[model samples]
Target chain A: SMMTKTAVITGSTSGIGLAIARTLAKAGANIVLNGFGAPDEIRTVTDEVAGLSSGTVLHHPADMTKPSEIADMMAMVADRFGGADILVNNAGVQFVEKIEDFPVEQWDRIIAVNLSSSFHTIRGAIPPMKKKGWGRIINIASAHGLVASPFKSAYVAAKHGIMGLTKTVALEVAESGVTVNSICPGYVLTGQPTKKFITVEQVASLALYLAGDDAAQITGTHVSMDGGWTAQ
Target chain B: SMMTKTAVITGSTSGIGLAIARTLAKAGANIVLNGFGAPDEIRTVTDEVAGLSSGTVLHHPADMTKPSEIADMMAMVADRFGGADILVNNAGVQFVEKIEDFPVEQWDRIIAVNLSSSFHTIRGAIPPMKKKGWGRIINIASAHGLVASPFKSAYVAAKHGIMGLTKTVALEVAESGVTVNSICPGYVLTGQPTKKFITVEQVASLALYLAGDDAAQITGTHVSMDGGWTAQ
Candidate 1:
């Protein structure tokens, strides 16, 4: 049943998101790219993805913080390629500030986009996936999801919340053929959201395999790609 | 400021809970023992704890699953001393069964006592801890909390859920000088919980250190006491 699959990756215009889109596209998956990019630039990337595989590449730009925008992105992906078989919820941003001085608005926005956005995309994609009786939801959390630092309280909180949500959803679909998991990368070297940088290609590799059939038994797990940072 | 602290440990009659009780008591913290045992047996153990340190050891037999009983146990600890400064939610049980045949009542009881009881105890003691501006909540989770095993779905899910709740509550009080963390031990030598399974005293030393003043920077982290079980 390893038919050619369709993948929808959020925040895929650049950095880790773009890296993931490239890896998945190279692996013979139809690429649905969503993020901030000029129309010409998106078209260029989309054409490159089309060159890799016969699969289509749809540029569906949207702000991750808005549910309606995310829904529209999903609709566009479905319209182009029937439906997404792999949904990588990788759109996230970080703001560092002390908890007392943390912006309440920023806190709400971060939680909505980084955490709840996964829920929105997952809910919208589940029906199409359940029809196929198979789906993969890979939430890109951070090392901070399990641990924390002095600053970045809001980011930490949202990540921890998403980690918990991933577990619950995995349980809900355990008996079903769908699975949900989080990949926690520490300080990825992506230009989009800088944080003391490190390379993120291995993350895309892990995500590609996770969406593949080999990772069926590996659901509900949080894989930490911290370069062994957490081990210390 | 190392103020004198007191910890109330439920199910301290024997095994891992008793080991934790003895370790904390030996560290100059007063112990409130709540477990089921013969009066003479309790007296002998109480004398043993008293001989190990200058701190006091009081007994209050209470069922952890019953909220009213746990409330009464907390009241007794408060009555003897001013109030509890530390709470160790360590009491637990395990029963293996296939998901199709898993008893709902058993699942309910296990989750109630092993996971929800910790929530109840923390809720009961938080008012005083907030007033004092300092407290420690150490939940004794298991290596299974971070991973799963066959035929132990209930135990695995409950432990994982407890860890999730630990992180959430830790963030809720991160700045209040009250820190909450879970210590996940892989294999501890305790006769009561796992009959005749031997875990050496040195294995649990990390958990003891985590509860000390030097571990102030560490909170909401599940310090694994496994012999590298999850690493594999």
Candidate 2:
């Protein structure tokens, strides 16, 4: 089985990342969880992921905004799990505002977390993945990455930037047995008001496919799972 | 007739930008051409554009990598043609290399020319367009903006960044009668190899459509005319 594989998923404490962690774990891949949550809540999630499959689980509270922390998390994964076979750069933050009224600090933070963090993580993980001659780098972008929504300047910018980073890295390691691709899900119903949002399980299922041998030829592309949100 | 309206298109000295300039001119919009080329060649292009319609034709040698030059070009358009009623941020440059092998200066220059120049042009044009309560902002992105190609790190990143900027600015000015959008074309057959590259006229015709009142409802969106390139 693929139980020996190590999957490092950022922002796995809840939402889509959490779903992906549990799904991958159920498929017999060891999980390294990263995100922010209370200790007890984090422990509960970790335990749930661990119970899903016969695979080890570890938690690393690496802030997506800090490159140093991201690097350390990658180092930890390498030390404990012998480098990442699959890296899911799923951590992200969203802010909505008109451009002129959009706060400068918020712009910087969103860019750092949603865009720059992926760059750092990819830089950190590529070497080990290339050495192994087998890897899957999946970026969790959004429908907004392909199109745009009014009033969400920072989020849209960061998502689009991440798509760029995904393509660039995919090409860099094309012949090296490592595939980099982005999964752009539209309107996932994590919380709040929703109009037919795609489910977390659906997103995770696609991630699972991307990480497997079946998806070996799929690289440098974005697979959208939006509920016809961008078909127009 | 759109004789009173001024259309400013960057990188119009050659390729797709040139086609767009002539297309708009034929529709009776005054043309402000911006790009780099031989003096005689530019003069021929200017005359050709001028002869296309009854509207005025002027050339501004704005360097895409220079924000000051871009700003000055916009100012000149405002002074001479009574502000840019249609602004097409089509100027760009491409460099191909792997991410690690890509030069830092190339990254900066590509970003500046292909991404930041649009930002500068948009910033300069928006105020005047807002004042008039009628405008169109079109960006010439690539299929690479929507996806990627190997060895084109800087080009892909800048195109994606411009897409981000397009969406952000579109949201900012949604209700202002000024619509912002991007055109993502697959390989255009200006030269070189062939598959089924989109033509310069195809791109220009789309620009012409976007500039008209028919496309007023379209904002914060990217229209892909990539010969089904991203359909996969």
Candidate 3:
């Protein structure tokens, strides 16, 4: 289903980003993986996804907290992939502390990674996708995007902000073939496994589904799977 | 959590409503259960909550689709409970069809039950909550409230409408210590099971928490648990 498409997934060194990268690659797309890791580790992830890809694969080490770095990465993808057919803004950071106790640097970092990074990526990705008159933009949000919990001031605000951005972009691109959406996944406690949780693979499969033709009407919205936590 | 407070839960005979009713009752609050059920079933529900409650329990069959009926139930609660301390709007109906195929009567009913009913409930509950200088209003919205899908025009609009109402009421009551919130839970297919889903008990616990002093700041927002479906 992904033949000839190119997908740029942020934070693909491991976890959800990696899973989505692999899925898109296996679907016959060119892939760009972005994140931080040891040189050897990043190369291995790139190679692994490349093996599954029908086209090309590259890893761009762009720090999400820095807009210039993100810009460079987007430009590189544009030059190479001939225009990104898909952009998955999956990079995020979680810093837990009371609002009063939250560190200034940490708060900034969370906003940049979880919120602003998507803005830059989407800002850069949209024009090219618009040019082609086709695109898929998926923001990997959390259940926190729709709700809130204590001691998650920065993360919650950032996630919430991205949801707003996702909706705006979707409306902006409604007439275009591009679809903008987000996936709000289950929340896991820090340093503890959730009793029942979502797998990175499952997240990736849904991302792939959203990228397909059948998902054209499913834009300007989100898909939620938080293990019933929000139902209460 | 509730101590001696009286909580009116619309559609409390079964499912999420019943769970919340019993939870509040167990917390030593009086409970009003309103729903559509046989007399015995309603009594059983009433008795079950009554046994757990330190205060009173009664079932008021207020058809949420009817504003007059909802108004009557609110007035009765005000008289019996000395003013509604907590209000939980849990009544809802779903009619799935394409937009063009949707019936006008069904559309109006959907909006009435899922949207305007909350408006009326909150309208009746707010004055008392403001007078008491504290209150809690919880709406049972959905992941659909945040997103949309095809064939769910009526349900989606109602859920989405309730969300707007939740936010406005929270702002309207921000200074009065009356917390307004919604629970955006996991989604299940109409006739099929979701791979992993939410239980009514979990939803009830969350509502109970929101009613407690611990969740005093958790207002005008939502609690989401959709099994990581939205994190895609």
Q: After superposition, how far is residue B226 of candidate 1 from its true place, in Å?
A: 20
Interface DockQ of each model: 0.05, 0.34, 0.02
Clashes of each: 3, 0, 26
Local accuracy of candidate 3 as per-residue lDDT tens digits, B56-142: 898888888776788798899888877789999989888875433455567557656776677667767877888899998999988
Q: What TM value does model 1 have? A: 0.55
* Candidate 1 displacement at residue B132 in angstroms: 10
lDDT of 2 by residue, B38-96 (tens): 99998998998999979789899888877678778878887886789998988888777
| Candidates in order: C-alpha RMSD to true structure | 9.5, 5.4, 14.7
Candidate 2 per-residue C-alpha lDDT over A1-232 given as tens digits, one digit per residue, 9 for 90 to 100: 3689999998999999999999899889899999999999999999999998798997999998777798799888888877899999899987876664565567667767787677677766887888999999999989888877766766787788778878878878999999999999987889113367799999999999999998999998899888776677
Q: Residue B126, candidate 3: how far off, in angstroms?
A: 25
Ranking by lDDT: 2, 3, 1
lDDT of 1 by residue, A188-213 (tens): 76612333455778788888878888
Candidate 1: clashing pairs of residues: A189-A198, B189-B198, B189-B199
CAPRI band for model 3: incorrect
Candidate 2 matches the true fold with a TM-score of 0.72
List the candidate numbers ranked by TM-score, top first.
Answer: 2, 1, 3
- DockQ of model 3, rounded to 2 decimals: 0.02
Q: Largest TM-score belongs to which candidate? A: 2
Query: Candidate 2: which stretches are off by over 4 Å?
Result: A25-30, A36-82, A103-108, A160-175, A191-202, A217-223, A227-232, B1-4, B7-83, B100-113, B116-124, B160-176, B185-232
